[PDB]
Amino acid sequence: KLAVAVVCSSNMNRSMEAHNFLAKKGFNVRSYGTGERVKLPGMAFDKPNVYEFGTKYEDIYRDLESKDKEFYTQNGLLHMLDRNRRIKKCPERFQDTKEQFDIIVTVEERVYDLVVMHMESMESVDNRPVHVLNVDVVDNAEDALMGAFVITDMINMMAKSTDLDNDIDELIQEFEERRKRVILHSVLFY
Ligand code: VO4
């Protein structure tokens, strides 16, 4: 089976909706954040809320519900965190994992550049190819769902291949034609 990672900035919304959805379809999936820290917004000429990666979703929830339970349920982050709590203990940060994947999917260009920069600045002697794909998804609950569909549909297609390194270029193109999207693609090595 393919090992897949899905990566946004904070590992709270887009990467976690896609996480949920890929796992519910049977995929081997982990998810990560490329930011320095996790941030979540609140009254928005305010400084948002910040927590180190490795902080539990449960405690973040608890920290916001005791800050203004109504506010954070209206803007749907209590919901979001409740949902995340059930998948895994805490947001994880991509530049500190040592997990290895066949495909890492980023949801925006800044994340895509942080991932590719990060792996280039490594290097070992596995020489094993990992494919980094960007599939743009907008950062709100609604588009996180829609983006999870599009991501799952693409993985589902790549998971048919028994020779992914030689098929992938061509699958990317069919998919781009059929969903009318641009998929950035890098090949990196572990
Ligand atoms: O946790 V992510 O907000 O960058 O969708």
GROMACS .gro file of C-alpha atoms and ligand atoms in nm:
model
  195
    1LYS     CA    1   0.000   0.000   0.000
    2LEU     CA    2   0.104   0.365  -0.058
    3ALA     CA    3   0.202   0.566   0.233
    4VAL     CA    4   0.071   0.918   0.203
    5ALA     CA    5   0.107   1.244   0.391
    6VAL     CA    6  -0.115   1.546   0.365
    7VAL     CA    7   0.034   1.880   0.476
    8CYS     CA    8  -0.110   2.224   0.538
    9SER     CA    9   0.027   2.500   0.759
   10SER     CA   10  -0.117   2.427   1.107
   11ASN     CA   11  -0.244   2.053   1.080
   12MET     CA   12  -0.578   2.163   1.194
   13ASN     CA   13  -0.814   2.208   0.900
   14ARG     CA   14  -0.733   2.114   0.544
   15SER     CA   15  -0.474   1.853   0.619
   16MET     CA   16  -0.701   1.696   0.889
   17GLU     CA   17  -1.022   1.684   0.674
   18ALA     CA   18  -0.819   1.512   0.408
   19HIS     CA   19  -0.654   1.289   0.669
   20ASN     CA   20  -1.002   1.177   0.786
   21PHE     CA   21  -1.131   1.119   0.444
   22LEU     CA   22  -0.833   0.930   0.307
   23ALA     CA   23  -0.832   0.707   0.621
   24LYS     CA   24  -1.208   0.635   0.596
   25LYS     CA   25  -1.137   0.510   0.245
   26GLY     CA   26  -0.872   0.268   0.357
   27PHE     CA   27  -0.554   0.468   0.284
   28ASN     CA   28  -0.237   0.472   0.491
   29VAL     CA   29  -0.227   0.844   0.570
   30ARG     CA   30  -0.058   1.088   0.815
   31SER     CA   31  -0.095   1.452   0.819
   32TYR     CA   32   0.140   1.758   0.915
   33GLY     CA   33   0.184   2.140   0.940
   34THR     CA   34   0.475   2.328   0.798
   35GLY     CA   35   0.432   2.641   1.006
   36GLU     CA   36   0.660   2.711   1.303
   37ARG     CA   37   0.366   2.686   1.536
   38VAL     CA   38  -0.001   2.625   1.523
   39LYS     CA   39  -0.224   2.924   1.497
   40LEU     CA   40  -0.593   2.968   1.514
   41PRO     CA   41  -0.768   3.299   1.477
   42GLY     CA   42  -0.984   3.497   1.732
   43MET     CA   43  -1.161   3.844   1.677
   44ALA     CA   44  -0.963   3.931   1.384
   45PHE     CA   45  -0.781   4.251   1.456
   46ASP     CA   46  -0.647   4.028   1.732
   47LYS     CA   47  -0.342   3.828   1.783
   48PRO     CA   48  -0.446   3.479   1.714
   49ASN     CA   49  -0.392   3.178   1.934
   50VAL     CA   50  -0.071   2.999   1.918
   51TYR     CA   51   0.045   2.665   2.046
   52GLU     CA   52   0.349   2.455   1.980
   53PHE     CA   53   0.313   2.148   1.760
   54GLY     CA   54   0.280   1.852   2.003
   55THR     CA   55   0.016   2.027   2.209
   56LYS     CA   56  -0.290   1.807   2.229
   57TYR     CA   57  -0.601   1.899   2.028
   58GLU     CA   58  -0.796   1.826   2.350
   59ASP     CA   59  -0.608   2.086   2.547
   60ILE     CA   60  -0.638   2.344   2.265
   61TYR     CA   61  -1.003   2.284   2.270
   62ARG     CA   62  -1.012   2.328   2.639
   63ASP     CA   63  -0.805   2.651   2.624
   64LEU     CA   64  -1.047   2.812   2.371
   65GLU     CA   65  -1.370   2.692   2.521
   66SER     CA   66  -1.252   2.856   2.847
   67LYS     CA   67  -1.169   3.173   2.649
   68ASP     CA   68  -1.508   3.223   2.491
   69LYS     CA   69  -1.688   2.904   2.436
   70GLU     CA   70  -1.951   3.087   2.224
   71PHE     CA   71  -1.709   3.261   2.001
   72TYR     CA   72  -1.511   2.952   1.925
   73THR     CA   73  -1.810   2.743   1.860
   74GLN     CA   74  -1.956   3.002   1.620
   75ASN     CA   75  -1.644   3.021   1.403
   76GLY     CA   76  -1.633   2.633   1.415
   77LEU     CA   77  -1.293   2.571   1.568
   78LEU     CA   78  -1.433   2.378   1.877
   79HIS     CA   79  -1.605   2.152   1.623
   80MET     CA   80  -1.282   2.121   1.416
   81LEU     CA   81  -1.078   2.038   1.728
   82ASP     CA   82  -1.333   1.783   1.857
   83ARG     CA   83  -1.303   1.617   1.517
   84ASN     CA   84  -0.923   1.620   1.527
   85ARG     CA   85  -0.898   1.480   1.886
   86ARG     CA   86  -1.052   1.157   1.749
   87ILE     CA   87  -0.795   1.103   1.484
   88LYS     CA   88  -0.474   1.163   1.670
   89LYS     CA   89  -0.331   1.311   1.976
   90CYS     CA   90  -0.183   1.639   1.848
   91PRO     CA   91  -0.080   1.858   1.554
   92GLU     CA   92   0.249   1.733   1.410
   93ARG     CA   93   0.512   1.928   1.228
   94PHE     CA   94   0.640   1.814   0.897
   95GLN     CA   95   0.994   1.934   0.927
   96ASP     CA   96   1.036   1.717   1.242
   97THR     CA   97   0.890   1.387   1.125
   98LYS     CA   98   1.113   1.102   1.019
   99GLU     CA   99   0.821   0.914   0.875
  100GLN     CA  100   0.883   0.841   0.501
  101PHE     CA  101   0.607   0.846   0.233
  102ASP     CA  102   0.544   0.760  -0.124
  103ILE     CA  103   0.339   1.086  -0.186
  104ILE     CA  104   0.314   1.405   0.010
  105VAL     CA  105   0.027   1.633  -0.091
  106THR     CA  106   0.045   2.007   0.003
  107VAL     CA  107  -0.262   2.228  -0.012
  108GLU     CA  108  -0.097   2.562  -0.112
  109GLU     CA  109   0.219   2.697  -0.271
  110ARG     CA  110   0.382   2.830   0.045
  111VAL     CA  111   0.345   2.483   0.202
  112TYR     CA  112   0.459   2.323  -0.115
  113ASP     CA  113   0.788   2.536  -0.113
  114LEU     CA  114   0.847   2.469   0.261
  115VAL     CA  115   0.813   2.098   0.202
  116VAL     CA  116   1.039   2.079  -0.101
  117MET     CA  117   1.295   2.310   0.054
  118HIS     CA  118   1.298   2.102   0.366
  119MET     CA  119   1.363   1.768   0.192
  120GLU     CA  120   1.623   1.911  -0.042
  121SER     CA  121   1.818   2.042   0.259
  122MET     CA  122   1.840   1.673   0.380
  123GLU     CA  123   2.008   1.386   0.233
  124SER     CA  124   2.065   1.017   0.293
  125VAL     CA  125   2.148   0.699   0.102
  126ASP     CA  126   1.814   0.543   0.061
  127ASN     CA  127   1.801   0.723  -0.271
  128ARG     CA  128   1.424   0.641  -0.252
  129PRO     CA  129   1.190   0.871  -0.456
  130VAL     CA  130   0.910   1.047  -0.279
  131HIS     CA  131   0.659   1.250  -0.500
  132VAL     CA  132   0.544   1.593  -0.364
  133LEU     CA  133   0.217   1.717  -0.519
  134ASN     CA  134   0.039   2.042  -0.458
  135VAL     CA  135  -0.331   2.049  -0.483
  136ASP     CA  136  -0.471   2.395  -0.392
  137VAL     CA  137  -0.737   2.409  -0.132
  138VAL     CA  138  -0.877   2.713   0.030
  139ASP     CA  139  -0.855   2.743   0.402
  140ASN     CA  140  -1.208   2.727   0.536
  141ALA     CA  141  -1.429   2.419   0.651
  142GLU     CA  142  -1.624   2.405   0.332
  143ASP     CA  143  -1.339   2.396   0.088
  144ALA     CA  144  -1.142   2.167   0.322
  145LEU     CA  145  -1.418   1.911   0.249
  146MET     CA  146  -1.416   1.973  -0.116
  147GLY     CA  147  -1.038   1.959  -0.134
  148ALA     CA  148  -1.049   1.632   0.060
  149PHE     CA  149  -1.260   1.489  -0.218
  150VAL     CA  150  -1.029   1.604  -0.493
  151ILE     CA  151  -0.718   1.473  -0.302
  152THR     CA  152  -0.874   1.138  -0.235
  153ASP     CA  153  -0.977   1.098  -0.592
  154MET     CA  154  -0.623   1.169  -0.710
  155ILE     CA  155  -0.455   0.924  -0.457
  156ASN     CA  156  -0.713   0.669  -0.550
  157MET     CA  157  -0.598   0.696  -0.897
  158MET     CA  158  -0.228   0.675  -0.824
  159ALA     CA  159  -0.278   0.376  -0.589
  160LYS     CA  160  -0.370   0.169  -0.908
  161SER     CA  161  -0.026   0.189  -1.043
  162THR     CA  162   0.232  -0.089  -0.985
  163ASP     CA  163   0.504   0.137  -1.116
  164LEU     CA  164   0.427   0.472  -0.979
  165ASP     CA  165   0.754   0.643  -1.071
  166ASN     CA  166   0.694   0.580  -1.438
  167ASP     CA  167   0.317   0.633  -1.445
  168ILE     CA  168   0.290   0.939  -1.224
  169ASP     CA  169   0.363   1.207  -1.479
  170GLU     CA  170   0.095   1.086  -1.704
  171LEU     CA  171  -0.161   1.036  -1.431
  172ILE     CA  172  -0.102   1.388  -1.317
  173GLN     CA  173  -0.186   1.517  -1.661
  174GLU     CA  174  -0.508   1.313  -1.701
  175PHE     CA  175  -0.621   1.428  -1.365
  176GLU     CA  176  -0.537   1.796  -1.433
  177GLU     CA  177  -0.741   1.775  -1.757
  178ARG     CA  178  -1.033   1.616  -1.593
  179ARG     CA  179  -1.054   1.834  -1.273
  180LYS     CA  180  -0.925   2.150  -1.445
  181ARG     CA  181  -0.645   2.216  -1.202
  182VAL     CA  182  -0.281   2.266  -1.180
  183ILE     CA  183  -0.090   1.995  -0.981
  184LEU     CA  184   0.268   2.099  -0.902
  185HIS     CA  185   0.507   1.802  -0.889
  186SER     CA  186   0.847   1.748  -0.740
  187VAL     CA  187   1.054   1.437  -0.712
  188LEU     CA  188   1.264   1.436  -0.394
  189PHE     CA  189   1.480   1.157  -0.236
  190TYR     CA  190   1.523   1.004   0.105
  191VO4     O1  191  -0.432   2.373   0.975
  191VO4     V1  192  -0.442   2.414   0.791
  191VO4     O2  193  -0.540   2.571   0.856
  191VO4     O3  194  -0.307   2.545   0.734
  191VO4     O4  195  -0.590   2.403   0.675
   0.00000   0.00000   0.00000
